[PDB]
Amino acid sequence: GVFAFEDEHPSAVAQAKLFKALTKDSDDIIPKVIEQIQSVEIVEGNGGPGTVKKITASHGGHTSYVLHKIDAIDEASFEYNYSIVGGTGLDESLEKITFESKLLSGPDGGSIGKIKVKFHTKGDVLSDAVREEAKARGTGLFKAVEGYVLANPNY
Amino acid sequence: GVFAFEDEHPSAVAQAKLFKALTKDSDDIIPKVIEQIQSVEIVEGNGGPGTVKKITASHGGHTSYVLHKIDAIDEASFEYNYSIVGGTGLDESLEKITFESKLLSGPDGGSIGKIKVKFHTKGDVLSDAVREEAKARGTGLFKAVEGYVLANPNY
């Protein structure tokens, strides 16, 4: 099945500024802000739709890793979608997880990031722990990037 | 005179975790998250009340620094107060600035950071540019530490 969940994250950061950090500069930000994440390397691609990246997090004894595919980037509507297509960080019960982000405008020139996470299960059931852990991990990357942009006016 | 402005900041971080971050680990966190803050040097003290710190920042080609004294740290009430007592970063119109921070219980086991900025002016007027810059700098330090804790549950 395909299980979809949605959250909204208001932010004081302007859409265009948050969108650029989310889509062009997140490879440099995420490793800086998240301790565990050691590196972000491009496996194939030029940064646009279709690019595959390997993100390595130090722990789980020595390591862990996940592979992300960028599915879509739409500057006009501030939509950014990516999938976790593999890696030890993708639970065995799942085919893939997709994150769809859209930055709506919020009060005071801020943003409201609508984040929908879709779980592509192998079967008919979705574990609660699997759902919760993946949502936290995806929300944490959004926050790492948004928090960085807040703390660094002009970067 | 003394001009006091207060703002509230909801957060999903629990009071005890955010309090620990703000008062024990901010010295390490702040220079990692905020690009222009070059360093945090303890001038005197061990980090507790009474400690004096020199925070050096760097813009365009321009360096500037400010001296912070930790005024109070009350763990039971989650109050953390510090003052900016001098430095090229403190405006000539001011004697000092005092940030009074208090973490209230928020919904979801999260918290509400109530931050009060007190400007101790040499005269009877406070410049708008001076008020906004200081208020932004101070909110930035709070948000930089909070963003870091959200991104790293277990640092």
mmCIF file of C-alpha atoms in Angstrom:
data_model
loop_
_atom_site.group_PDB
_atom_site.id
_atom_site.type_symbol
_atom_site.label_atom_id
_atom_site.label_comp_id
_atom_site.label_asym_id
_atom_site.label_seq_id
_atom_site.Cartn_x
_atom_site.Cartn_y
_atom_site.Cartn_z
ATOM 1 C CA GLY A 1 0.000 0.000 0.000
ATOM 2 C CA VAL A 2 0.799 3.731 0.040
ATOM 3 C CA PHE A 3 0.317 5.468 3.416
ATOM 4 C CA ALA A 4 0.334 9.341 3.302
ATOM 5 C CA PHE A 5 0.715 11.637 6.306
ATOM 6 C CA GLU A 6 0.837 15.457 6.289
ATOM 7 C CA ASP A 7 2.266 18.122 8.682
ATOM 8 C CA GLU A 8 2.733 21.868 8.426
ATOM 9 C CA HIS A 9 5.680 23.761 9.754
ATOM 10 C CA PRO A 10 5.345 27.533 10.014
ATOM 11 C CA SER A 11 8.608 29.390 9.601
ATOM 12 C CA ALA A 12 9.657 33.037 9.641
ATOM 13 C CA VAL A 13 11.957 32.457 6.678
ATOM 14 C CA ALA A 14 10.826 33.713 3.288
ATOM 15 C CA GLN A 15 9.792 31.065 0.772
ATOM 16 C CA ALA A 16 12.406 31.839 -1.842
ATOM 17 C CA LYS A 17 15.207 31.852 0.731
ATOM 18 C CA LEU A 18 14.131 28.587 2.412
ATOM 19 C CA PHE A 19 13.489 26.962 -0.991
ATOM 20 C CA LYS A 20 17.022 27.784 -2.201
ATOM 21 C CA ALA A 21 18.589 26.411 1.019
ATOM 22 C CA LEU A 22 16.382 23.282 0.742
ATOM 23 C CA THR A 23 17.237 22.632 -2.873
ATOM 24 C CA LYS A 24 20.675 24.011 -3.810
ATOM 25 C CA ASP A 25 22.587 24.366 -0.570
ATOM 26 C CA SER A 26 21.311 21.565 1.622
ATOM 27 C CA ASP A 27 24.263 19.267 0.780
ATOM 28 C CA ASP A 28 26.635 21.715 2.592
ATOM 29 C CA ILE A 29 24.244 22.566 5.433
ATOM 30 C CA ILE A 30 23.022 19.219 6.598
ATOM 31 C CA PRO A 31 26.485 17.831 7.481
ATOM 32 C CA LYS A 32 27.385 21.056 9.333
ATOM 33 C CA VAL A 33 24.168 21.127 11.486
ATOM 34 C CA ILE A 34 23.600 17.419 12.022
ATOM 35 C CA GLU A 35 26.439 15.903 14.102
ATOM 36 C CA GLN A 36 25.945 12.301 13.004
ATOM 37 C CA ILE A 37 25.747 13.056 9.263
ATOM 38 C CA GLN A 38 29.338 12.743 8.034
ATOM 39 C CA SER A 39 28.909 13.481 4.328
ATOM 40 C CA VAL A 40 26.580 13.887 1.373
ATOM 41 C CA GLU A 41 27.880 12.572 -1.935
ATOM 42 C CA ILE A 42 26.237 12.557 -5.356
ATOM 43 C CA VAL A 43 26.066 9.032 -6.744
ATOM 44 C CA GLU A 44 24.696 10.162 -10.160
ATOM 45 C CA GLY A 45 23.242 13.432 -11.426
ATOM 46 C CA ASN A 46 23.710 17.222 -11.712
ATOM 47 C CA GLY A 47 21.591 18.330 -8.792
ATOM 48 C CA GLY A 48 18.265 18.303 -10.640
ATOM 49 C CA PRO A 49 15.377 15.731 -10.875
ATOM 50 C CA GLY A 50 16.698 12.183 -10.943
ATOM 51 C CA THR A 51 19.916 12.862 -8.935
ATOM 52 C CA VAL A 52 20.838 10.086 -6.522
ATOM 53 C CA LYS A 53 22.753 10.949 -3.296
ATOM 54 C CA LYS A 54 24.338 8.849 -0.533
ATOM 55 C CA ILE A 55 24.087 10.321 2.959
ATOM 56 C CA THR A 56 26.283 8.677 5.593
ATOM 57 C CA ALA A 57 25.529 8.962 9.315
ATOM 58 C CA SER A 58 28.214 7.925 11.823
ATOM 59 C CA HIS A 59 26.981 5.524 14.546
ATOM 60 C CA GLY A 60 25.114 2.162 14.621
ATOM 61 C CA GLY A 61 28.482 0.811 15.726
ATOM 62 C CA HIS A 62 30.514 2.404 12.942
ATOM 63 C CA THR A 63 27.937 3.617 10.349
ATOM 64 C CA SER A 64 24.532 3.808 8.563
ATOM 65 C CA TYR A 65 23.469 5.339 5.228
ATOM 66 C CA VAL A 66 20.555 6.142 3.029
ATOM 67 C CA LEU A 67 20.110 6.823 -0.674
ATOM 68 C CA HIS A 68 17.940 9.751 -1.775
ATOM 69 C CA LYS A 69 16.557 10.370 -5.217
ATOM 70 C CA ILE A 70 15.348 13.888 -6.119
ATOM 71 C CA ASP A 71 12.014 13.402 -7.745
ATOM 72 C CA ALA A 72 10.918 16.909 -8.537
ATOM 73 C CA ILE A 73 11.918 20.551 -8.111
ATOM 74 C CA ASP A 74 9.551 23.336 -9.044
ATOM 75 C CA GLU A 75 10.787 26.822 -8.282
ATOM 76 C CA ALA A 76 7.526 28.523 -9.470
ATOM 77 C CA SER A 77 5.442 26.682 -6.873
ATOM 78 C CA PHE A 78 8.156 26.022 -4.294
ATOM 79 C CA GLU A 79 7.694 22.241 -4.468
ATOM 80 C CA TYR A 80 10.536 19.888 -3.700
ATOM 81 C CA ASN A 81 10.028 16.130 -3.607
ATOM 82 C CA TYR A 82 12.604 13.445 -2.799
ATOM 83 C CA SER A 83 12.520 9.654 -2.038
ATOM 84 C CA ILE A 84 14.599 7.377 0.148
ATOM 85 C CA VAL A 85 15.117 4.504 -2.283
ATOM 86 C CA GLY A 86 17.457 2.390 -0.251
ATOM 87 C CA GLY A 87 20.147 1.954 2.300
ATOM 88 C CA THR A 88 20.212 0.459 5.746
ATOM 89 C CA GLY A 89 18.252 3.519 6.917
ATOM 90 C CA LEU A 90 15.184 2.306 4.870
ATOM 91 C CA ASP A 91 13.175 -0.208 6.891
ATOM 92 C CA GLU A 92 12.787 -3.660 5.402
ATOM 93 C CA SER A 93 9.009 -3.465 5.304
ATOM 94 C CA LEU A 94 9.122 -0.629 2.826
ATOM 95 C CA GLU A 95 9.785 -0.255 -0.924
ATOM 96 C CA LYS A 96 10.492 3.454 -0.490
ATOM 97 C CA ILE A 97 9.388 6.580 1.371
ATOM 98 C CA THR A 98 8.572 9.806 -0.437
ATOM 99 C CA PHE A 99 8.677 13.334 1.026
ATOM 100 C CA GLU A 100 6.705 16.039 -0.767
ATOM 101 C CA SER A 101 7.368 19.577 0.325
ATOM 102 C CA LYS A 102 5.583 22.695 -0.605
ATOM 103 C CA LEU A 103 6.294 26.176 0.792
ATOM 104 C CA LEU A 104 3.138 28.204 1.180
ATOM 105 C CA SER A 105 3.413 31.828 2.141
ATOM 106 C CA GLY A 106 2.848 32.548 5.816
ATOM 107 C CA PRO A 107 2.032 35.717 7.793
ATOM 108 C CA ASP A 108 4.791 38.352 7.953
ATOM 109 C CA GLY A 109 6.520 37.290 4.733
ATOM 110 C CA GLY A 110 7.255 33.917 6.354
ATOM 111 C CA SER A 111 6.592 30.385 5.122
ATOM 112 C CA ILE A 112 4.453 27.397 5.970
ATOM 113 C CA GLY A 113 6.105 24.215 4.788
ATOM 114 C CA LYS A 114 3.554 21.527 3.963
ATOM 115 C CA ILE A 115 5.330 18.206 4.224
ATOM 116 C CA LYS A 116 3.563 15.029 3.101
ATOM 117 C CA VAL A 117 5.406 11.708 3.731
ATOM 118 C CA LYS A 118 4.263 8.693 1.683
ATOM 119 C CA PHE A 119 5.231 5.192 2.801
ATOM 120 C CA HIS A 120 5.297 2.562 0.043
ATOM 121 C CA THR A 121 4.824 -0.663 1.950
ATOM 122 C CA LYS A 122 5.489 -4.161 0.718
ATOM 123 C CA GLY A 123 2.323 -5.304 2.481
ATOM 124 C CA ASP A 124 -0.884 -4.009 4.035
ATOM 125 C CA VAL A 125 0.431 -2.947 7.413
ATOM 126 C CA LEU A 126 2.666 0.004 8.480
ATOM 127 C CA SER A 127 4.538 -0.297 11.780
ATOM 128 C CA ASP A 128 3.970 2.648 14.171
ATOM 129 C CA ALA A 129 7.637 2.776 15.115
ATOM 130 C CA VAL A 130 8.633 2.745 11.423
ATOM 131 C CA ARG A 131 6.210 5.551 10.665
ATOM 132 C CA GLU A 132 7.316 7.693 13.563
ATOM 133 C CA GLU A 133 11.052 7.278 13.049
ATOM 134 C CA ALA A 134 10.992 8.129 9.353
ATOM 135 C CA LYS A 135 8.772 11.243 9.977
ATOM 136 C CA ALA A 136 11.143 12.452 12.610
ATOM 137 C CA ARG A 137 14.166 11.926 10.388
ATOM 138 C CA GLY A 138 12.568 13.766 7.445
ATOM 139 C CA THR A 139 11.334 16.617 9.670
ATOM 140 C CA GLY A 140 14.761 16.906 11.262
ATOM 141 C CA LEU A 141 16.448 17.650 7.838
ATOM 142 C CA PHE A 142 13.840 20.309 7.153
ATOM 143 C CA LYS A 143 14.526 21.873 10.582
ATOM 144 C CA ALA A 144 18.308 21.601 10.196
ATOM 145 C CA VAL A 145 18.103 23.644 7.012
ATOM 146 C CA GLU A 146 15.479 26.086 8.238
ATOM 147 C CA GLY A 147 17.276 26.646 11.548
ATOM 148 C CA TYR A 148 20.528 27.338 9.702
ATOM 149 C CA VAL A 149 18.902 29.918 7.445
ATOM 150 C CA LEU A 150 17.283 31.657 10.453
ATOM 151 C CA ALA A 151 20.540 31.812 12.417
ATOM 152 C CA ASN A 152 22.438 33.055 9.317
ATOM 153 C CA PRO A 153 20.581 36.076 7.856
ATOM 154 C CA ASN A 154 22.749 36.472 4.778
ATOM 155 C CA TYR A 155 24.607 33.248 3.968
ATOM 156 C CA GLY B 1 16.126 54.749 30.881
ATOM 157 C CA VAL B 2 15.454 51.029 30.666
ATOM 158 C CA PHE B 3 13.348 49.863 27.690
ATOM 159 C CA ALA B 4 12.010 46.295 27.820
ATOM 160 C CA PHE B 5 10.530 44.324 24.882
ATOM 161 C CA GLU B 6 9.306 40.800 25.248
ATOM 162 C CA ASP B 7 8.684 38.048 22.684
ATOM 163 C CA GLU B 8 7.521 34.426 22.906
ATOM 164 C CA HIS B 9 8.910 31.506 20.976
ATOM 165 C CA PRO B 10 7.094 28.117 20.923
ATOM 166 C CA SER B 11 9.375 25.102 20.497
ATOM 167 C CA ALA B 12 8.946 21.319 20.386
ATOM 168 C CA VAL B 13 12.104 20.802 22.479
ATOM 169 C CA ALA B 14 11.402 19.932 26.139
ATOM 170 C CA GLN B 15 12.209 22.559 28.692
ATOM 171 C CA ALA B 16 14.994 20.579 30.451
ATOM 172 C CA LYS B 17 16.734 19.681 27.191
ATOM 173 C CA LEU B 18 16.582 23.181 25.722
ATOM 174 C CA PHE B 19 17.661 24.687 29.089
ATOM 175 C CA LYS B 20 20.692 22.422 29.223
ATOM 176 C CA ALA B 21 21.604 23.399 25.619
ATOM 177 C CA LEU B 22 21.284 27.183 26.277
ATOM 178 C CA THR B 23 23.279 27.238 29.503
ATOM 179 C CA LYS B 24 25.905 24.454 29.165
ATOM 180 C CA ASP B 25 26.549 23.793 25.494
ATOM 181 C CA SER B 26 25.840 27.063 23.720
ATOM 182 C CA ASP B 27 29.565 27.888 23.588
ATOM 183 C CA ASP B 28 30.150 24.916 21.301
ATOM 184 C CA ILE B 29 26.940 25.101 19.335
ATOM 185 C CA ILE B 30 26.845 28.789 18.507
ATOM 186 C CA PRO B 31 30.128 29.002 16.484
ATOM 187 C CA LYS B 32 29.138 25.854 14.480
ATOM 188 C CA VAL B 33 25.687 27.137 13.525
ATOM 189 C CA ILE B 34 26.331 30.833 13.122
ATOM 190 C CA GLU B 35 28.789 31.451 10.277
ATOM 191 C CA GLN B 36 30.024 34.883 11.298
ATOM 192 C CA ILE B 37 30.538 34.090 15.006
ATOM 193 C CA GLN B 38 34.261 33.162 14.917
ATOM 194 C CA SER B 39 34.712 32.230 18.521
ATOM 195 C CA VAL B 40 33.459 32.226 22.134
ATOM 196 C CA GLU B 41 36.280 32.721 24.702
ATOM 197 C CA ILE B 42 35.756 32.524 28.449
ATOM 198 C CA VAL B 43 37.397 35.627 29.943
ATOM 199 C CA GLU B 44 36.765 34.547 33.533
ATOM 200 C CA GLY B 45 34.672 31.885 35.274
ATOM 201 C CA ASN B 46 33.651 28.274 34.639
ATOM 202 C CA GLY B 47 30.457 28.857 32.671
ATOM 203 C CA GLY B 48 28.180 29.412 35.686
ATOM 204 C CA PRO B 49 26.721 32.727 36.981
ATOM 205 C CA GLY B 50 29.331 35.513 36.946
ATOM 206 C CA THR B 51 31.299 34.041 34.002
ATOM 207 C CA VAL B 52 32.426 36.634 31.485
ATOM 208 C CA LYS B 53 32.720 35.689 27.819
ATOM 209 C CA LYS B 54 34.004 37.496 24.738
ATOM 210 C CA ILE B 55 32.170 36.650 21.598
ATOM 211 C CA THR B 56 33.948 37.682 18.381
ATOM 212 C CA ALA B 57 31.997 37.973 15.090
ATOM 213 C CA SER B 58 33.045 38.765 11.506
ATOM 214 C CA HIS B 59 31.252 40.550 8.637
ATOM 215 C CA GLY B 60 32.309 42.123 5.350
ATOM 216 C CA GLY B 61 35.943 42.787 6.185
ATOM 217 C CA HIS B 62 34.868 44.056 9.587
ATOM 218 C CA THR B 63 35.430 42.329 12.958
ATOM 219 C CA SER B 64 33.521 43.269 16.164
ATOM 220 C CA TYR B 65 33.163 41.690 19.576
ATOM 221 C CA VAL B 66 30.952 41.873 22.533
ATOM 222 C CA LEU B 67 31.418 40.863 26.184
ATOM 223 C CA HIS B 68 28.695 38.764 27.920
ATOM 224 C CA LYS B 69 28.329 38.343 31.716
ATOM 225 C CA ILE B 70 26.119 35.338 32.800
ATOM 226 C CA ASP B 71 23.850 37.019 35.393
ATOM 227 C CA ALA B 72 21.676 34.196 36.612
ATOM 228 C CA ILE B 73 20.966 30.561 35.931
ATOM 229 C CA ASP B 74 18.050 29.077 37.874
ATOM 230 C CA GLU B 75 17.404 25.507 36.924
ATOM 231 C CA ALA B 76 14.138 25.078 38.936
ATOM 232 C CA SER B 77 12.418 27.966 37.209
ATOM 233 C CA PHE B 78 14.278 27.575 33.860
ATOM 234 C CA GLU B 79 15.595 31.126 33.890
ATOM 235 C CA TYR B 80 18.805 32.096 32.181
ATOM 236 C CA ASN B 81 19.856 35.732 32.175
ATOM 237 C CA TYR B 82 22.930 37.359 30.567
ATOM 238 C CA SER B 83 24.060 40.902 29.795
ATOM 239 C CA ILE B 84 26.100 42.451 27.058
ATOM 240 C CA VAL B 85 28.362 44.731 29.075
ATOM 241 C CA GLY B 86 30.794 46.077 26.468
ATOM 242 C CA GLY B 87 32.458 45.691 23.143
ATOM 243 C CA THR B 88 32.629 47.330 19.744
ATOM 244 C CA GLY B 89 29.403 45.371 19.151
ATOM 245 C CA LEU B 90 27.494 47.312 21.880
ATOM 246 C CA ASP B 91 26.114 50.621 20.516
ATOM 247 C CA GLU B 92 27.430 53.899 21.852
ATOM 248 C CA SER B 93 23.926 54.922 22.965
ATOM 249 C CA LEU B 94 23.800 52.011 25.442
ATOM 250 C CA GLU B 95 25.182 51.231 28.911
ATOM 251 C CA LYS B 96 24.232 47.581 28.499
ATOM 252 C CA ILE B 97 21.643 45.142 27.223
ATOM 253 C CA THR B 98 20.107 42.430 29.361
ATOM 254 C CA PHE B 99 18.434 39.302 27.962
ATOM 255 C CA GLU B 100 16.155 37.595 30.417
ATOM 256 C CA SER B 101 15.102 34.119 29.266
ATOM 257 C CA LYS B 102 12.494 31.840 30.718
ATOM 258 C CA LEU B 103 11.273 28.470 29.330
ATOM 259 C CA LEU B 104 7.557 27.954 30.115
ATOM 260 C CA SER B 105 5.734 24.575 29.647
ATOM 261 C CA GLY B 106 4.315 24.408 26.162
ATOM 262 C CA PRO B 107 1.877 21.890 24.614
ATOM 263 C CA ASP B 108 3.140 18.418 23.568
ATOM 264 C CA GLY B 109 5.770 18.381 26.324
ATOM 265 C CA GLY B 110 7.491 21.161 24.328
ATOM 266 C CA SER B 111 8.302 24.617 25.609
ATOM 267 C CA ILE B 112 7.752 28.331 25.225
ATOM 268 C CA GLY B 113 10.768 30.542 25.331
ATOM 269 C CA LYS B 114 9.780 33.968 26.679
ATOM 270 C CA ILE B 115 12.678 36.320 25.932
ATOM 271 C CA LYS B 116 12.764 39.819 27.374
ATOM 272 C CA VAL B 117 15.380 42.283 26.088
ATOM 273 C CA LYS B 118 16.162 45.254 28.360
ATOM 274 C CA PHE B 119 18.059 48.203 26.891
ATOM 275 C CA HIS B 120 19.780 50.408 29.424
ATOM 276 C CA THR B 121 20.113 53.671 27.558
ATOM 277 C CA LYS B 122 22.396 56.572 28.367
ATOM 278 C CA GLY B 123 19.601 59.023 27.395
ATOM 279 C CA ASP B 124 15.776 58.922 27.119
ATOM 280 C CA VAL B 125 15.431 57.633 23.594
ATOM 281 C CA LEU B 126 16.244 54.277 21.975
ATOM 282 C CA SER B 127 17.028 54.245 18.256
ATOM 283 C CA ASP B 128 14.913 51.934 16.103
ATOM 284 C CA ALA B 129 17.919 50.472 14.239
ATOM 285 C CA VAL B 130 19.671 49.843 17.589
ATOM 286 C CA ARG B 131 16.585 48.105 19.024
ATOM 287 C CA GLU B 132 15.993 45.824 16.019
ATOM 288 C CA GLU B 133 19.603 44.720 15.479
ATOM 289 C CA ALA B 134 20.106 43.783 19.153
ATOM 290 C CA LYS B 135 16.730 42.008 19.299
ATOM 291 C CA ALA B 136 17.569 40.104 16.127
ATOM 292 C CA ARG B 137 21.088 39.196 17.275
ATOM 293 C CA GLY B 138 19.678 37.911 20.577
ATOM 294 C CA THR B 139 16.824 35.946 19.028
ATOM 295 C CA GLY B 140 19.306 34.506 16.565
ATOM 296 C CA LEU B 141 21.441 32.996 19.370
ATOM 297 C CA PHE B 142 18.337 31.401 20.942
ATOM 298 C CA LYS B 143 17.057 30.017 17.572
ATOM 299 C CA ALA B 144 20.536 28.761 16.582
ATOM 300 C CA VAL B 145 20.748 26.608 19.748
ATOM 301 C CA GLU B 146 17.115 25.446 19.526
ATOM 302 C CA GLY B 147 17.500 24.481 15.836
ATOM 303 C CA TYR B 148 20.620 22.513 16.719
ATOM 304 C CA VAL B 149 18.848 20.524 19.421
ATOM 305 C CA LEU B 150 15.890 19.683 17.119
ATOM 306 C CA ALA B 151 18.310 18.473 14.483
ATOM 307 C CA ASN B 152 20.375 16.447 17.053
ATOM 308 C CA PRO B 153 18.038 14.831 19.613
ATOM 309 C CA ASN B 154 20.964 13.026 21.300
ATOM 310 C CA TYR B 155 24.048 15.258 21.185
#
